[PDB]
Structure formats: structure tokens, C-alpha cells
Amino acid sequence: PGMPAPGLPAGFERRFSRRYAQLDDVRLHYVTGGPDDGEMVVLLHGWPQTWYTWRHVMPALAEDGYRVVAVDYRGAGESDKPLGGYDKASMAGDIRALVHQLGATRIHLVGRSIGVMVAYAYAAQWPTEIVKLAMLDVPVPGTRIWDEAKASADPQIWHFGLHQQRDIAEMLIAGKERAYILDFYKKRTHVALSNDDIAVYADAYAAPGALRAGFELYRAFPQDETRFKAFMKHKLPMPVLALAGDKSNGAKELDMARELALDVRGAVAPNTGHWLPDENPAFLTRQLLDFFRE
Amino acid sequence: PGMPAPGLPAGFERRFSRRYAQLDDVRLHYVTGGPDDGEMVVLLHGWPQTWYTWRHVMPALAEDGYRVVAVDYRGAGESDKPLGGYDKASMAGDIRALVHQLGATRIHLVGRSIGVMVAYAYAAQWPTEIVKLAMLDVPVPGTRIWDEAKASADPQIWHFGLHQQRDIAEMLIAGKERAYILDFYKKRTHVALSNDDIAVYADAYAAPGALRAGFELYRAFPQDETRFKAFMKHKLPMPVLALAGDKSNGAKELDMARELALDVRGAVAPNTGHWLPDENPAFLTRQLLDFFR
Amino acid sequence: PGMPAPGLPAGFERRFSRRYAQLDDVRLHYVTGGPDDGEMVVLLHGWPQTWYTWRHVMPALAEDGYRVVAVDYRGAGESDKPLGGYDKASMAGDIRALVHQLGATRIHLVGRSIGVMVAYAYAAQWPTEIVKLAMLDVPVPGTRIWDEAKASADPQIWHFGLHQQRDIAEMLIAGKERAYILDFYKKRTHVALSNDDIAVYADAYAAPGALRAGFELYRAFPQDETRFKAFMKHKLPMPVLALAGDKSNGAKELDMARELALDVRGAVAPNTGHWLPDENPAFLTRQLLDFFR
Amino acid sequence: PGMPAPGLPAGFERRFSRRYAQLDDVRLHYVTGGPDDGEMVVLLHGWPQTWYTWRHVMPALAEDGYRVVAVDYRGAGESDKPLGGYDKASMAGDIRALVHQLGATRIHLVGRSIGVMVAYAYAAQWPTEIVKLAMLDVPVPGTRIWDEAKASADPQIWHFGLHQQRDIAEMLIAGKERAYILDFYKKRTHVALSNDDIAVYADAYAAPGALRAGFELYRAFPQDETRFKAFMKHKLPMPVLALAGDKSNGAKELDMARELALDVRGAVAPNTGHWLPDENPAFLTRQLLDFFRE
Amino acid sequence: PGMPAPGLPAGFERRFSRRYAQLDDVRLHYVTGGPDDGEMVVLLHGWPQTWYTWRHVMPALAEDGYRVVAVDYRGAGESDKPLGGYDKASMAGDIRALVHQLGATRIHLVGRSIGVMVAYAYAAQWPTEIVKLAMLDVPVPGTRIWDEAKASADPQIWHFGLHQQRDIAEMLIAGKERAYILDFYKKRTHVALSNDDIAVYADAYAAPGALRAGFELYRAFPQDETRFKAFMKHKLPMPVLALAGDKSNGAKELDMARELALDVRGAVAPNTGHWLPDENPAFLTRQLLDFFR
Amino acid sequence: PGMPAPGLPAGFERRFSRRYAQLDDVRLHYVTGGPDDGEMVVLLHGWPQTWYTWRHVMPALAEDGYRVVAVDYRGAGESDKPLGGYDKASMAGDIRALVHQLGATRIHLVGRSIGVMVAYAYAAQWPTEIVKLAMLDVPVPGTRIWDEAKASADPQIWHFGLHQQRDIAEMLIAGKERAYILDFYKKRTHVALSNDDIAVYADAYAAPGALRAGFELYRAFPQDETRFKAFMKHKLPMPVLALAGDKSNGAKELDMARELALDVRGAVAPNTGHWLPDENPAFLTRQLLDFFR
């Protein structure tokens, strides 16, 4: 019992930091904490999110010794918004480059929504470099669950069409990001969240270029589908964990992951909606720790 | 006494929780706190309000062991905004289905403004399920006080006309929810309230569809008048308490309740306007807790 | 057969002129034509209108030798927008001062909507100076037809409440005058009108102060009610004509007028809604010419 | 050759009239011309259109002795915008009540977009009352052409999702009706049209309630699918003509119609996009007169 | 003598047609007239322009038997606005694909501003296919005239910096296209132009995506610089004409062209600023007809 | 290390004060703290900043007994926005007149961006009055580094062109100061800063006339180039310290200072971008305090 408590968890400010990494043309923003020599855990948000969605998971990961890296991927948050490169395979290259610049070679990888597609493209292109992979909330293109949501005309993906209308989507939503994003979020949540927390996301997507860059993730879905379907001719060898809330995709995250990897295990969060990190960070943190422990 | 203190009362975060209930068509948002096994007290806000109007009534209420369920009814606050179902009788059915969901099956009902019409419609359709009922601040359709406000062209119900203009009302007020709602509120209050508290209501009604959903409550008034007139031909058997501020509807809130229910008692709040839960919670809780003994 | 033809009728531009009259504080705008020596016919528009509503009536009146004066009353159109003076009795004084300044003293008087209240106040205060009075479309305050629309909560006066909200009405409608007024007009019309014609009205009410000044006509209704009830203790002695469309107030214009005058005759416009000069000017000009002859 | 010529054709003003029909609670606006005693031809526009889309077709129909009735259906143009009644079967009832008020019982019926769904529901519910039916540009719900566009996630129906979002669609598009509708239109045309003509439609949809009422046609699609599938158990007996542009649906209007009626004939307009009355009224006028003489 | 006459020249409407060409991903809009069998002349506008800038040149070309094709290149006017492909070499590929789709393969080519960069990239990549090339008003990247404007910080390219700011440029200029573009045009003109003509351009750049697509032409300049410097290791073999107004770049169009081609001839337009087709179409058509003959 | 901490440092309220100084034309706003009798340290911000950029440098500075005077120069922050005087030399004269007002007559000067041009112009015109001088972050006009940024078309000075467009820059950015300034800032930083701190700058430049006044600083650049070139023919006699972040101008801030002054020393701040007082105050104060021994 208790009303929603907005903001970063107590003491977060003291341990975690905001940092920037210059890559070949693109600058990525990320939040990193924990011991510098520890096993690196890279966390990838989705749409419409930033690194901030991991605010309640990052402390616990770091309190078990890991080197936490929460990335604003290309086009999101405080990261640069280049013209293109929003297909998920190339965005995985951005994350790999960041990781290499931070001195690492093998990483644990957690992604949700758009971020779990980037994470999969990371594991598919450089499988030796991903020790363990955690897949949250959303199916990846190329899977059967994905093709079904599309062929059924699933009401939950009504926005795929709109987001893929270049310039039109931006013209409609500019100036109404808070109203559009708060409604998008609340229709898919089950645990009550604080408006001040969701407004952190909405305000990021109101910054110049943030709407456009976010929508280009959706505009690359056809290219991602063709690319990911080729990726799925070699199932992943590393251990994979699949999680989703019972009031949204649930079990279908584990069904989806088993089309992509040989070593799969999964759980469904009780009384939890689409935003696992926002709604049920305790369940998520534990599952990641039990999963990341040998 | 001193200046208005905005926000939830101290310690409120710790004791209450926000929850959702999925019904067939609609998902309803509600706030609860206190022991689970206790007698349930259902609170129904009005226009232009949310559950937040009971912020000073719910703590004390469930410090005495009551199960407090403060509901955003269909279309308000964080609840869904469906196409229809905005007649007050069907809205009562939504509240019953949520009550049934929570495991209860008989409760104590308190309502003001639109909520008191829902609260009455609840008691009228399922008399057995309402232990008691507290009518606050506003008369219900079908009563004489309601019909006399209409015949008087009472200055206070000036907004009935505008709110009943579909699309026109939304077009005029969209983007001006704060200015419209703060003025609507301050013109009907007597105790000075904080802008920050009124802005909580205004911001909810600025949300997508919230203007339309609230205005459809007014667009259903003719249907409610016919329906409530049928309900009042069977006077309520339960004890009923009527309260209103002396600067607004005063004692005709009591007179209105006598038209509907047999076992009625009432009081008039001193130096308080239209918004009893906001203006004088102290008088109100104290009145509620005694009534609830 | 035919699509609506917007604008002034052919030849209007060469026969009529826009003019201003400076009174002691207020400058009034008016359009005039016909012989300088002819019997003067004063035409008073209402809300949301200007002199332009008489555009299809004025040529025929001028061809029959009448001196046509279509006035933008205080606060409307191109006239000044003073702070006050929007009670109808004082606005009749404005029209009388302009009439005296043009060298006339006895006049034929035609009014609709707000203008028929001004026109009645003119006739009640100076009955010897009004030769004949024609009353269109809307009842005047103080009559039982007026009180009956109010007590019934007639849907067609929903806007009384909103317009009487000082500052709120202006804030809601500023910048949306075209949408608000076009909708107001079409919901009450029966003959299809051209949007370009109604926008001439809407554009006038978008000019600085025009919204405020027009709503002050509505904010003065209680004072008009008290003032007109005293006027109605003495029925009007001059001949009176009552007209309205069969699809709007119809015969109630004649019922309303018989409480106001001893010598009343009336007719109902066929296939006509609320805007007699806009919808059926052919019927209106014929009835006026026969009445004034 | 020639540049686009905007507006009504010469002489239109003296030959047609704007009229209203009061139904039991809703008022409908329509434009009518031609002989009072002639065979009635009812024309039903779609989204985002009004009667004005038939401006180049109504003169030729009326000069051949037909009584033309181009209707703004419920919620569109100058018609009333009630709360409900936006399922296509009920909207056909509105059209029938207005035809009956004009003294007619037998009509030729032409529809496109949403109007062809109303026109089909008219013929399905009162088949004896429809002499001939012409179906333009768009498939109706329940057909497999309709169901295959849905299962493909066909890019040309991207807007079905957005339009079905109550309040979100109105909030995003209010104040941008011109930019939204001009783009919607030009992306589906092949013949160059004048901006002034499309703006006539866009300005109608900027009117109070016109966006909401238009989107409720789309929010009623599930109910239309159930209702229309039942309608197609009994194929239509009257002669049916199917037309579409080769650069849009083309021959699939012809396939779609053959699932609905026994006596079907069709043609495909050359070098024509989605908006047959706007783009190639010469072809359409020729096709309708030949069909109505037959 | 004469005030500026806005719009298309008389008879243009009956002689030319707007058409679309679907390429493999992009649909291009273009205006064409003259004999279907004539030698094809392709005209490429720049920023902030559309095909409409050739309105006073196309009739004379068509009367002399040329097949006129005035193209809205990728991202401009009524053409599609794809995500990328705004480097000038790829945009030349778009124009070539449209030319091949119209049944032609050898063409006369005219370009100004961005279009002269596209036109040069066309000639550099497919020199056998360009019969003659006419270069107007603006230097192309890679030349010393281009580098000299950059190193000098020429005030006339102040906008390069702003247009290369992705998302920032769009946010600043969205909704103010008319003020931004009219000012840009008049500061560089010498002959007075009609505001209605320039607004045809401004209104195009206000349509969805048009601002973004046009600025991507500027954001591709570094890539164009690298690509064109490689192209300039082989001077163009076909005849080249260089033109600019005496009040703008003047003889520097001929200096720039001589770094690009072996066979170059040039002239300077009298009493002409930056917009040769808008300001002095009479001089431009004469020079083009003599060059192509 | 951890997350950015927005606002003034703890205890700041207590130790510093806001004051105004009326000069002949203009009133200047400035912040001060520390002992009155101490050596005065003058701080000059740049674009787009106010005194607030020194919030982490001024405390420590005057904990060592310095007299800290952080000035909003002519046109910035809470200072007046006159018509002219935006060449950097005259702005130095304004700073001197304020220094004279405060009773001092020789001081220590620290400046960045526009302030370092003012600070240099101060030392150039009255060499005797400046004890020492710390140049931060930006090269001054007339130097080679300045001239090479112009010839390179350095991507960082993209805004010189736009800011030099009178009325155009104000029209584009008015109402978009926060989005424009936050982006301008974050693109040039390396240490992550809080939006709340950057918004303080943005809100000042949203004030009436603040956009115009700041942009006139850029519109005077050609005049400053001529004036500073004259000043640099007499190399400065005072000790000069040059600092810049390694991710921005780095060591050419030192190279730039050697062009102007004889006794120069410098350092380059590690892992810091363009905004030394904002990004690494710690390195900066420590560097300043040592230099100031």
C-alpha cells in the first residue's frame, strides 16, 4: 500500500552519473554507476522512454557489484538526433561502440520495447560479446508474435501507422507531447504511476528533433523486419531471459524469445502492465539478479 | 486560523493507494486506504472534481476502521472516457460492479454534485445494498429544488446551457480549463482555497476527452430527470444525511433529501460555500463520523 | 432554383452610403439611402448582427420613397464600444439622438432581436415620435412569452447564461468568433445561407471590444426586465406589426406584442426560421411596405 | 493539357439549390437540381468529403433528365453532428428517410469511400428500392478485399488506427485540418488537383464537431464488419457498376463488388488515382450515363 | 512602365499541365508543355523555389518547339519529401530517371541555385546525355568561387549555418515561412517583384516536410563538396552557358563555370539581382534560345 | 561523482547581494559579496549568459577576501537594454564607470565569450587599471584564431550569420528562447548540466529586448574587428591567464592570448567543453585563486 512516489530513488544522486560519449559522428548520453571493474550491464529503454525508466533497477544492480550503463540510444533523451541510422542493427553498432569506448568487451544486456530490438540485433551480430540477454515487454520484428499482432490488426499497435507518416506525425504531435505521451502510457499501465515521472519522458520527446528521431525507429520497421528475419536463421547461443506483465503481453514474451534463442527461460509479472521497469521494479530487479548469477 | 495549506494532508502518501478496476466496457480509477476488512465507505465526487476532493475526509474516516474507496467515476480523473453511459443510473451500475469486484456487497455511500445523483441512483436501483447515504451540496434531478432552480433561471446553473452544447463547449474551453475551472470554483466558495489545489482538478479536465466526458454528464440531464422521477415514487428506506453550506444551497439540501428519503437528518455548515469537502472537511468528517455510529 | 448569392444586392453600392454620427459621448455608424426628404424608417439589428442584416430590405424601402437609416447600435459593428449604457432604454436614447441629428423627429421603426427591445424602449419613452413600429423574431423582456422561455429552460436561450458571465464569455470566445457565430446562426436558420454573409457578422464581433459590448446587452437583461415591466403598465398607442418565421417563434411574436400595444396585427413567415431579414427578405419587405402605407 | 481549374463549373449556381431535410431528430443538408419529376440519382460522398465532390458530375446527370440529390450525410458538411448513428446501416436509413420525404421511392444510387458503404447498406436493406447501384474507389467492410487490406497492414489504411482513437485524433488534428487533409488527399491522387478545391473539404472538417463526427464513422468499423458480413449472405439483385482508378484500387473494386452482387460490370479509369469525381469526372460521367440507360 | 503583374502569364493555363512521375521510391511533380516530339529542355529551380520560378521562361521555349519539363526536385513543391537522398549527385539520378521515363535520353539542362548543383552532377555523371547545360546565378560546391564565399564569410551565405542546424532550423522557421522567405527574396532582388508571386514559393515551403527537405539540401553540402571535387578532375565536354545578374554574382558565374567545363561562354544580366528567372526572364529566354540553337 | 546539482551553492543567499548602478545612459545590474575593502575581482559573462554563470566561482573567491563584482553587461540579464553602445570597447567603458562608482580604481578582470572581448577592451584602453586578466573559453576578434574560425567556416560559429540578421533573428527565436538556448548550450558542453540551470539563462533572454540586445553584440562584430586590431598593435603589459576546455577551443585560447599579451600563462581543463564556469568551476576557481597569489 502507498501512493506513487515520483522521482529518483533515495540516494540515487549520490551514486549514479550522467555522461556523454563521442562516437564517429554521433554523441550518446548515458548514466553509469557501480564499480568500474565490475561486469558491465547495459540497459536499453524503448519508446517513449529515456534512461530514466531504469531508475529503480539501477541501484540494485549496482548494489550487487555490476557496472551499470543506462543508455539514451541514438535520437533519444540527451543523445544526438542524426538524420538517419534508426534501423535497429545499426543502433546496436552505436551501443557496441560505446561499450568498447568504456573499456569493455563482453556485457550483460537488458532491453525493452525498441531497446529489446536493438539488444537482439546486438546479440545476433556479435553473439560472443553478449554474456546474457534479458528481453522485456515487447516482441521483436521477425517473430511470429510480431507478425500476428500486425495481421490481426491488434488495437495496441494502432500507432504504428501514424508514427510511420513522415512529417505528418511530427506536425500533429508537436506541442502536444505531454498529452499524447501521458495517454499512451496510462492506457497500457496497470500499476498507477505518477504524472511527474511520465512527464520526464514527455518533456524529453518535446525537445527539438526528439519526436522525429523517435518516429524514425518506427519508419525503419520494414527494414528491421527483413534484417531480423535473416538474423533468426541462427538462434542465439547465450542464455536469454524473457519477462512481461500479465496485463499486457505476458507469456508471449517467452514464446517470442524461444523463436530467437536456444537457452530461454521466462516469467510473467503479476498485476503488471506494459512498463515493467516503471510498474514492478522489485520483480524485475530480482529476476535480473537471479538470472545474472551463475 | 491562517492561510490555506495546499496538497494532501501530512502522512497521506503512506496510507492510501491508487488502483484500477477493469469492468466490461470501462476501467475505473479509485483511491483507497485503511484496513481491508472494514465497512466500506464509497465517495463520489462531482463536476469539476476528482477523488482528490475527499483528501481531508478519507484519513480520519478510515482511522476509525472504515474501508475508503474514493472513485473517479466514468469519464473523470484517471478513469476511461468511453463514448456513452453518462446517465447517472448506468454510472451507478459501474460503481456497483467495482464494489462487487472489491469483495464488498453492502456499503456506505457519500456523494456530491454529479456524484450525489449517481449515489442516489445507486440507492434507488439496489436499496438493499446501501446501508446509509450522505447527500452533499447539490440537489438531484426530479426534486422540487431542482425544478425550481430551473424555473428561477437560478444564476448558479448558468453553465447548464453551455455544457449541453456538444462540441461547442469543448471548442470554447479546450486550452482554457484552468481559467474556466478556477473561476467556476472561486465564485461558489466561501472559505479561501489555494490555487494549487483547484489546479489539480483543472489539470485533470484538460486531459484528452475529459472535457467531453464531463459535459456528457450535463447532456444526459433530460434523461436523468425522467429516470429519477420514476425512482422517487419509491421513497428510500435507508437512513439519509443531507449537508450543504449556508452560503450556497443551505437547507434546501435537506428539503431535497426529504423528497426522496424517509429517515433523513441534516445540518447546515457555517460560513461555507458550495464545496463542502474542500471548504470545511473538519465539519464534514465530524458530521460523517457521527452519522456513521 | 439557385445557390445562395452572397454579398450586397446589385446596385446597392451606388445607392447607399456609410456614415457616422457623433453624439455626446458615443459615435454611431449607420448606412443610409433614399430621398433626404422622405419619411424616415429606422432599422435596428440584433445579436450577432450589424446593419448588414437589412441589406435585402433597404433597397425596396428606398425605391418607395422612404429615407432608410440602418444603424449599428451602441457597441455593434463600426460603432463605438463605450464602457456602459447597454440597457435598452438608454440605447433607444442613442437612436433618438441620431434621428434628431438627421433632422427628423417622427419615424417608422423596425427591430429584431436586441434591436426590437431598443425599438420598444424607444416607443415606450417617446410614443408620439414613433409613427409605426414593426417587431421581428424575438420577444422583449417583461412579457409573459419572455418569462415563459426562461421558466421552461428553453434550449434556444441556452446562451443567456454564458453571455451573462462577465470576462469569462469573452475569454472563451475570443479568437473563435467565426465558429461560435456561424454555428449559432445555422442552428436557428431554415433557409440555407452563404457562409460569406454570416462571416460579415462574425468578423464584426471579432474586432476589439465587440465581444464585450454585445455581451453587455445580455448582462443588462435584469435591468431591462425591471424597466420594461414598468413600461408595460401603459400599452403602446401607435400601430404595431408583429412578425416571425413559422419554423421559429411564429405566432408568439404576435402574442408577445399584444401584451405591449393596443393596436397590433401580425403574420407568420412561411418556410422561415429565426433570421427573417436573412432568410425571407421578400416576405419582410412586402409586409413592411403594406404596413407603412 | 491544361492547368487545374478550381471551383464549381460554369452555370452551376443557377441550376442547383441548397436544401435541408429534417429527419426525426437529425437535419441533413443536400444539394439538388434537375427536373422535379425525373428519375432520382442520389450521390453519397465519403471522407474527407462533402457533396462538393460531385460538382463536375451533377450537371451532366441533371441535363439528361435526372433528379440529382447530393447529400451531406450524417455528421458531414452542413449536416447536423449528433452523438451517434454513425454505423453505416443506420446512416443508410437517414438517406432513405430523406428520399421518402422528397416523394421518391425508386432511386439510382452512387457512392464512394464511406458513402459506398452507406449505399451498399441501402441496397442490402431495401433492395427493391434501388434500381441501380454504382460503387466507386473503395471496398466495403466484410469483403475479402477489405479483410486482405487489414491483414497486410496495407500502408493506405494507416489512418484507420489513428481515426479510431477517440479524443486523441481530435486533439491532434484540430487546428490542422487543412494540412492534414490536403496531405491525405494529394498522397492518393494521381491527377493534379487545385489546393482551393481540397480546401473546401478541409474547411468543412474544421467546423465544430465535424472532426469528431467524421472519426466516429471509423470508430464504427467493427460494428459495420459484423453487420455487413450478414448482409452478404444475400447478393444484391439489381445491376451494379464498379469503378476505380488504375493508380489506386483499380480492378479490386470490381472483385470486391462481385462478392456482393450477382449482376456486376466494371471498368478501371486510366491514369486516375483514388478520387474519381475529382480526378476524372469525364470518365465517371460517361460510365454513369451508360450504366443508367442500359 | 508598369506595376508588377502577379501570376502565370496569359495563356499558360491552356498550354501546360501538372503531372507526377512515380520513380522507385520517390514521386516527383513536374509541369510540362510543348510538342511531345521536341527536344527536351529540363529546368531545375533552387531554394526557396519551385517549378513556378520558370513561369515566364517556359512559354517561349515551348513556342520554339522544345519539350519543356520544369521539375520540382526531390523534397520541393508538390514532390515527395523522403528521409534522405539530398546530396546533389543522387538528386541528379532522380531527374535522369524521370527523363528516361518520359521517353527521352538526351536533354538540354538549365539550373539555378540548388538546381545548378543537381544539373552539374547530372552532366558530370552522364556527360553523353547532356546536349547543352546552362548555369544560373549561384556557384557550385568544389569551385574556388564557392570556397571563396566561405572563407570570406560572405554575408550572402549567412543562412548556410542556420539551415545546417538539424531540427533547430525547422523549429525556428515553422509558421513564419512567409516572413522568412519574402525577406530572403527581397534582400537579393533588384527588380521589384509582386508579393503574391513570392508567396507561391513561401506557401510551398510551409507544407508538411518542405522545410526539413529543403534544409537537407544544405545539410548535404559537405558531402557535395567532396563529391564535386572528384567530379572536377574531368572538365565537362558539352557546351556550357553561364549567367548571373550584374547586381548579384555577375561575372563570377562564368569564373565558376570555367573551372567546371572546357567549352564555356557567359553573359551578365543588366539591371538584375539574384533571381534571374523572376527578375529578367526576357534576357534569360533570349540567351537560352540562342544557346540551344 | 554523481548527478548535476542545480541552483546556487549552499549558503549563497546569505553572502552576496544584487545591486544596481545608474550610469549616464544605462543602469547596470551586478551581484556582489565578500569584504568591501578587498581587492576587487570583476567577472564578465558572455552569450547566452548572465552573472549566474559565476555562481560556483564567486564564493571561494571572496572567502579569500576578494571584492567580487559579477556584472550583467549592457543589454544582458537585469541590466538596461539601450539602443546602442554594443561595440565591446564602449561596453568596457560602462564597466569602468561602474568600477569607479564602487570606489575602486584598479582591479582584477576575468571574462568569457563576449565578456572576454569586453575584458580585453578594458585592458587595452586603460592598461593601468587592470592588475591582471583571465581570458576564458573564447578567442577575441582580431586574433588569428578568430580569423581562422571564420575562414574555416568553423561549425561552431554557425550562429554568427543568423544573429547578425536584424529583426529576422528576433522574429525566429522570440518565444523559442528556451529550446534555442538549451540546444546551443548542450551542443557545446561536455559535463552534463541541469536543465534548471540552463533555463535561468534562457528565461533572461526571453525578457523584453534581451534578444535584440544580445544580437546587437554580434551585429557589432565588424566594428569590433577593426577596433581590436588597433588595440593589438600594443601588446598588453599585465600578467594574463588563458583557460579553455580540452573538448572545445583548448590550447588555442592560450595561443590567442599570446597574440595580445606578453606575460601569459595558461592551462587546459580536462574533460570539459565550452562553458568553463558552468562545467568545471572547481578547476577554474582553483586555477583563479592560484593565479591570484
Residue B237 grid coordinates: 428506506
Residues in D touching C186 (Cβ below 8 Å): 78
Count Cβ neighbours within 10 Å for each residue of D256-277 and write b for 16 or more, e otherwise: bbbbbbeebbbbbbeebbbbbb
In degrees and rounded to multiples of 5, residue E184 shows phi and psi of -55, -45
| Look-up of cell digits 569584504 | F35
Contact predicate A20/A27, CB 8 Å: yes
DSSP state at residue A261: B
The technique by which this structure was obtained is X-ray
Of C160, C161, C176, the CB nearest to B172: C176
Residue F283 grid coordinates: 578547476
Burial of A282 (0-12, 13-18, 19+ CB in 10 A): exposed
Q: Which of B217, B45, B32, B188 is nearest to B116 (CA)?
A: B45
Contact predicate A116/A255, CB 8 Å: no
Helix, strand or coil, per DSSP, at residue B263? strand
Cβ contact D33–C179 (<8 Å): no
Taking the C-alpha atoms of residue D65 and residue D119, their distance in angstroms, rounded to an integer, is 22
Residue D76 grid coordinates: 458531414
> Domain range holding D77?
1-294
Residue B77 grid coordinates: 480523473
Residue A221 grid coordinates: 520497421
Q: Which of A254, A261, A291 is nearest to A137 (CA)?
A: A254
Name subunits touching F (3+ CB pairs < 8 A). Answer: A, E
Of D150, D161, D172, the CB nearest to A172: D172
In degrees and rounded to multiples of 5, residue F32 shows phi and psi of -140, 160
Q: Which of C191, C188, C54 is nearest to C134 (CA)?
A: C54
H or E element, residue E103: none
Taking the C-alpha atoms of residue D112 and residue D134, their distance in angstroms, rounded to an integer, is 9
| Look-up of cell digits 553587461 | F73
DSSP state at residue C190: S
Contact predicate C217/C201, CB 8 Å: no
Provide the residue type at F242 as one letter.
Answer: A
Residue E222 grid coordinates: 559537405
Cα angle E134, E99, E127 (rounded to 5 degrees) comes to: 50
E74 contacts: CB under 8 Å, gap ≥ 6? E26, E28, E80, E81, E82, E85, E86, E91, E94, E213
In degrees and rounded to multiples of 5, residue C36 shows phi and psi of -60, -25
Provide the residue type at E88 as one letter.
Answer: K
Q: How many residues does chain A have?
A: 294
Provide the residue type at F206 as one letter.
Answer: A
Cβ contact A216–E171 (<8 Å): no
Q: Which of E249, E257, E252, E258 is nearest to E276 (CA)?
A: E249
F250 contacts: CB under 8 Å, gap ≥ 6? F244, F268
Taking the C-alpha atoms of residue D83 and residue B288, their distance in angstroms, rounded to an integer, is 40
Identify whether B239 is preceded by a cis peptide bond (ω within 30 of 0).
no
Q: Which residues of E touch D (CB under 8 A)?
A: 8, 12-20, 29, 33, 78, 207-208
Q: How many residues does chain C have?
A: 293
B234 contacts: CB under 8 Å, gap ≥ 6? B124
Pairing assessment for the beta strands E264-269 and F16-22 based on DSSP bridges: unpaired
CB under 8 A, 24+ apart: contacts of A23-26: A23/A94, A23/A97, A23/A98, A23/A101, A24/A97, A25/A82, A26/A74, A26/A79, A26/A80, A26/A82, A26/A85, A26/A94
Taking the C-alpha atoms of residue C90 and residue C26, their distance in angstroms, rounded to an integer, is 12
Residue B156 grid coordinates: 448558479
Taking the C-alpha atoms of residue C59 and residue C281, their distance in angstroms, rounded to an integer, is 11
DSSP state at residue A249: T
C-beta atoms surrounding E134 within 10 Å: 24
Question: DSSP H helical segments within chain C, as ranges?
Answer: 12-15, 58-63, 88-101, 114-125, 144-151, 159-163, 168-173, 177-188, 195-206, 210-219, 221-231, 252-258, 276-279, 281-292
Cβ contact E179–F171 (<8 Å): yes
Residue A10 grid coordinates: 533515495
How many domains are contained in chain D? 1
Q: How many CA atoms lie within 13 A of E247 on its CB side?
A: 15
Provide the residue type at C209 as one letter.
Answer: G
Contact predicate C60/C10, CB 8 Å: no
Preferred mutation among C144, C160, C162 to probe B, highest tally of B CBs within 10 A: C162
Provide the residue type at F251 as one letter.
Answer: A
Residue E41 grid coordinates: 529542355
C-beta atoms surrounding B12 within 10 Å: 16
Q: How many residues does chain E have?
A: 293
B159 Ramachandran zone, left/alpha/beta (phi>0; psi -120 to 50): alpha
Taking the C-alpha atoms of residue B65 and residue B55, their distance in angstroms, rounded to an integer, is 17
Contact predicate E257/E169, CB 8 Å: no
Preferred mutation among B172, B182, B218 to probe C, highest tally of C CBs within 10 A: B172
Count Cβ neighbours within 10 Å for each residue of A218-228 and write b for 16 or more, e otherwise: bbbbeebbebb
Q: Quick one: chain E helix, strand, coil %, rounded to 5? A: 45, 20, 35
Contact predicate A223/A256, CB 8 Å: no
The C-alpha torsion from B138 through B143 and B145 to B148, rounded to 10°, is 130
Pairing assessment for the beta strands C240-245 and C264-269 based on DSSP bridges: parallel
The chain A residue lying nearest F194, using CA atoms, is: A18
In degrees and rounded to multiples of 5, residue F15 shows phi and psi of -105, -10
Whether D contacts A, i.e. 3 or more CB pairs less than 8 A apart, is yes
As beta bridge partners, residue C261 has C236
Angstrom CA distances, C176 to B174, C172, D208, stand at: 12, 8, 10
Measured in whole angstroms, the distance separating CA E201 from the mean position of its chain's CA atoms is: 13
Q: Give me the DSSP letters along A206-246.
A: HSTTHHHHHHHHHHTHHHHHHHHHHHTTS-B-S-EEEEEET
Residues in E touching D1 (Cβ below 8 Å): 14-17, 33
The chain D residue lying nearest C195, using CA atoms, is: D78
Helix, strand or coil, per DSSP, at residue A49? coil
Question: DSSP H helical segments within chain A, as ranges?
Answer: 12-15, 58-62, 88-101, 114-125, 144-151, 159-163, 168-173, 177-188, 195-206, 210-219, 221-231, 252-258, 276-279, 281-292
Angstrom CA distances, B189 to B56, B116, B273, D249, stand at: 17, 19, 5, 62
DSSP state at residue F156: G
Whether E contacts B, i.e. 3 or more CB pairs less than 8 A apart, is no
Q: Which of A178, A139, A162, A158 is nearest to A274 (CA)?
A: A139
Taking the C-alpha atoms of residue C29 and residue C47, their distance in angstroms, rounded to an integer, is 16
* Secondary structure string (H, E, C) spanning A84-98: CCCCHHHHHHHHHHH
C-beta atoms surrounding A17 within 10 Å: 15
Contact predicate E201/E52, CB 8 Å: yes
Resolution in A: 2.2
Of C162, C164, C171, the CB nearest to B179: C171
Q: Give me the DSSP letters along D56-108.
A: TTHHHHHHTT-EEEEEE-TTSTTS---SS--SHHHHHHHHHHHHHHTT-S-EE
Name subunits touching E (3+ CB pairs < 8 A). Answer: A, D, F
Pairing assessment for the beta strands C27-33 and C16-22 based on DSSP bridges: antiparallel
The chain D residue lying nearest C184, using CA atoms, is: D208
Cβ contact B209–D167 (<8 Å): yes
Residues in C touching D50 (Cβ below 8 Å): none
Where do breaks (C to N over 2.5 Å) occur in chain F, by preceding residue number? none
Burial of E175 (0-12, 13-18, 19+ CB in 10 A): exposed
Task: Supply the angle between the helices E210-219 and E195-206 in degrees, to the nearest 10.
Answer: 90
Task: Supply the angle between the helices A114-125 and A221-231 in degrees, to the nearest 10.
Answer: 40
Of E158, E160, E171, the CB nearest to F165: E158
A132 Ramachandran zone, left/alpha/beta (phi>0; psi -120 to 50): beta
Measured in whole angstroms, the distance separating CA F218 from the mean position of its chain's CA atoms is: 14
